């Protein structure tokens, strides 16, 4: 949280927009992975008593 340091980043490029987008894409994939494996049924079937 140093203002002087942050001034060097904005001169350094748009690497962060690449990093946070990469980790956002890696985050949506994890949600998609669990959806693909498990959400294979459109209804919740119930075992008989």
């Amino acid at each position: 949280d140093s203002t002087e340091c942050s001034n060097l980043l904005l001169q350094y490029g748009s690497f962060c927009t690449q990093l946070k987008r990469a980790l956002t894409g890696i985050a949506v994939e994890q949600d998609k992975n669990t959806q693909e494996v498990f959400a294979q049924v459109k209804q919740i079937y119930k075992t008989p008593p």
């Binding site: 049924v41 459109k42 209804q43 919740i44 079937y45 119930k46 008989p48």
Partner: protein, 50 residues
């Protein structure tokens, strides 16, 4: 709202009950798949030191 997985349904299971369809439906679904991305080439000299 809290997510709902789907319409809860209970199957009428019974030692001696069978359910057999009397009809069908020829459903034609669709599936999309990427195959090839864009072939890109770069030139270091023309890029790094124009």
């Amino acid at each position: 709202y809290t997510m709902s997985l789907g319409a809860e349904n209970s199957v009428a299971y019974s030692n001696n009950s069978i359910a057999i369809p009397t009809n069908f439906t020829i459903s034609v679904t669709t599936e999309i798949l990427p195959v090839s991305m864009t072939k890109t080439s770069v030139d270091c000299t023309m890029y790094i030191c124009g």
